Amino acid sequence: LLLSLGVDPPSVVGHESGWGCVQLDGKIVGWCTYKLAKHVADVLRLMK
């Protein structure tokens, strides 16, 4: 669902300045801007 929702984990460094990390119980699953991180958090909470 994260990969569907706008984040992507790379093989070579798919990372830049503003992009913050998203962490699945100790496993890096993607990178996304904090606005999109907040949107993902809220939509995940409401789906749950």
- List residues near another protein by CB under 8 A: 12-13, 15-17
The C-alpha R_g of the chain, in whole angstroms, comes to: 11
- The residue (of 15 and 35) whose beta carbon lies closer to another protein is 15
3-state DSSP of the chain: CHHHHCCCCCCCCCCCCCCEEEECCCCEEEEECHHHHHHHHHHHHHHC
- The residue (of 4 and 17) whose beta carbon lies closer to another protein is 17
- The residue (of 7 and 31) whose beta carbon lies closer to another protein is 31
How far apart are CB 18 and another protein at their closest, in Å? 9
